Amino acid sequence: SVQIVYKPVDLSKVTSKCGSLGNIHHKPGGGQVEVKSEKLDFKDRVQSKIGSLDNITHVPGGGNKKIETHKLTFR
Amino acid sequence: SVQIVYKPVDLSKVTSKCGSLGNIHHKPGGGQVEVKSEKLDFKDRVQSKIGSLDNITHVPGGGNKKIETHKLTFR
Amino acid sequence: SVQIVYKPVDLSKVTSKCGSLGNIHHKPGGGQVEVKSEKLDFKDRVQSKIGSLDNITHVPGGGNKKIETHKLTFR
Amino acid sequence: SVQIVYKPVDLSKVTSKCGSLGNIHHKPGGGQVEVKSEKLDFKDRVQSKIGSLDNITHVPGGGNKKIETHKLTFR
Amino acid sequence: SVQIVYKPVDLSKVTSKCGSLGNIHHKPGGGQVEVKSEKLDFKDRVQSKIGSLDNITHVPGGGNKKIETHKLTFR
Amino acid sequence: SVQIVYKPVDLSKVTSKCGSLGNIHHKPGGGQVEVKSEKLDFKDRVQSKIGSLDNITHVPGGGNKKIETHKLTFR
Alpha carbon separation from B68 to B8, B10, B65, C10, D45 (Å, rounded): 11, 10, 10, 10, 79
Overall residue count recorded for chain F in this entry: 75
Distance CA E64, CA E14 (A): 7
Q: After which residue numbers is chain E interrupted with C–N beyond 2.5 angstroms?
A: none
Give Cβ neighbours of residue F54 (< 8 Å, ≥ 6 apart): E53, E54
Show the 3-state SS of chain C: CCEEEECCEECCEEEEEEEEEEEEEECCCCCCEEEEEEEEEECCCEEEEEEEECCEEECCCCCCEEEEECCEEEC
How close does chain B come to D45, measured CA to CA in Å?
A: 44
CA F17 – CA E20 distance, rounded (Å): 10
- Interchain CB distance below 8 Å, E62 and F24: no
Any residues with CB less than 8 A from the CB of A74 and at least 6 apart, and which? A4, B2, B4, B73, B74, B75
Chains with at least 3 CB pairs less than 8 angstroms from chain F: A, B, C, D, E
How far is Cα B56 from Cα A12, in angstroms, rounded to an integer?
Answer: 33
Task: Flag if A52 and B55 touch (Cβ within 8 Å).
Answer: yes
Chain B residue with Cα closest to E24: B23
Cβ contacts of A48 within 8 Å, gap of 6 or more: B46, B47, B48, B49, B50
Say which amino acid occupies B24. I
Question: Cβ distance A28 to B28 under 8 Å?
Answer: yes
CB B64, CB C14: distance < 8 Å = yes
Residue contacts between A and B (CB atoms, under 8 Å): 290
Whole-angstrom distance, CA of residue D15 vs CA of residue D47: 42
CA distances (Å), origin E67, targets A25, C64, E5, F70: 43, 49, 22, 12
- Looking only at the bridges linking them, the beta strands covering C3-6 and B3-6 are parallel
Residue B61 near residue A65, CB atoms below 8 Å: no
Distance CA E33, CA F34 (A): 6
Q: In what helix (H) or strand (E) does residue B18 lie, and over which residues does it extend?
A: strand B13-26
- Please return the burial class of F42, using the count of CB atoms within 10 Å of its CB with bins 0-12, 13-18 and 19+: middle
How many beta carbons lie within 10 A of that of residue C70, not counting itself? 14
Binary contact (B19, E20; C-beta < 8 A): yes
Strands D9-10, E9-10: pairing kind: parallel
Q: Which residues of B32-69 are buried (b: 16+ CB within 10 A; e: fewer)?
A: ebbbebeebebeebbebbbbbbbbbbbbbbbbbbbebe
State which H helix or E strand residue F2 sits in: none
Distance from C-alpha of D18 to C-alpha of C54, rounded to nearest angstrom: 39
Say how far apart CA D6 and CA C8 lie, in whole Å: 75
CB atoms within 10 A of CB A75: 6
8 Å CB contact between A62 and B66: no
> Hey, what's the torsion of the CAs at C11, C14, C19, C25, to 10 degrees?
-160
Spatial neighbors of C62 by CB under 8 A, at least 6 apart, are B60, B61, B62, C16
CB–CB of F69/F10 below 8 Å?
no
Which one, of A22, F55, D64, C8, lies nearest residue E22 by Cα? Answer: A22
Chain C residues close to B61, C-beta within 8 Å: 16, 18, 21, 60-63
C58 contacts: CB under 8 Å, gap ≥ 6: B56, B57, B58, B59, B60
Give the list of residues 6+ apart from residue F69 with CB closer than 8 angstroms, or none: E68, E69, E70, E71
The chain C residue lying nearest B1, using CA atoms, is C1
Between CA E37 and CA D50 the distance in angstroms is 13
Report the alpha-carbon distance of residue E29 to residue A11 in Å, rounded.
53
**Residues in CB range of D17: below 8 A, 6 or more apart:** E16, E17, E18
Contact E52, F28 (CB under 8 A): yes
Cβ neighbours of F9 in E, within 8 Å: 7-10
- Closest-approach residue (CA) in chain B for E21: B20
Please tell me the distance in Å from C4's CA to the nearest CA on chain A.
10
- Alpha-carbon dihedral sign for residues A28, D32, E26, C24: negative
Please state, in angstroms and rounded to a whole number, the distance separating the CA atoms of residues C57 and C27: 10
Residue at E27: amino acid letter: K
| Cβ neighbours of B30 in F, within 8 Å | none
The DSSP annotation for D22-67 comes to EEEEE-----EEEEEEEEEEESS-EEEEEEEES-EEE--S---EEE
The strand order across the sheet containing A3-6 reads A3-6, B3-6, C3-6
Cβ within 8 Å of residue E14, ≥6 positions away? D13, D14, D15, D64, D65, D66, E64, E65, E66, F12, F13, F14, F15, F64
Whole-angstrom Cα distance, residue D32 to residue D50?
11
- Which of A17, A18, A20 is the mutation pick for testing E, counting most E CBs within 10 A? A20
Q: What angle do CA B20, B24, B27 make, to 5 degrees?
A: 175
The distance between the two most distant Cα atoms of chain D, rounded to a whole number of Å, is: 77
Q: Do D20 and C23 touch (CB under 8 A)?
A: no
Left if phi > 0, otherwise alpha if psi is -120 to 50, otherwise beta: which for E23?
A: left
Classify strands E13-15 and D13-15 as parallel, antiparallel or unpaired.
parallel
| Cα C12 from Cα B12, distance rounded (Å) | 5
Could you give the C-alpha distances from A33 to A28, A56, B37, C33, C34, in angstroms and in order?
12, 20, 14, 10, 11
- Are E55 and D59 a contacting pair at CB < 8 A? no
Is A44 in contact with B46 (CB distance < 8 Å)? no
Rounded Cα gap, residues F19 and F3, in angstroms? 51
HEC string for chain A = CCEEEECCEECCEEEEEEEEEEEEEECCCCCCEEEEEEEEEECCCEEEEEEEECCEEECCCCCCEEEEECCEEEC
Buried b / exposed e over E32-45, threshold 16 CB at 10 Å, is: ebbbebeebebeee
Contact C23 F23 (CB under 8 A): yes
Rounded Cα distance between B38 and A37, Å, is 6
- Say how far apart CA C64 and CA B14 lie, in whole Å: 10
Determine the residue of chain A that is closest to F19 in CA distance. A19
Residue D51 C-beta-side C-alpha neighbours within 13 Å: 34
- CB-based contact C4:A6 (threshold 8 Å): no
Cross-chain CB nearest to D70 (options E5, E21, E71): E71
E29 with F25: CB under 8 angstroms? no
> What is the spatial distance between Cα D35 and Cα E50, in angstroms, rounded to a whole number?
11
Closest CA to C27 of B34, E23, E27, B30: B30
Technique behind the model = cryo-EM
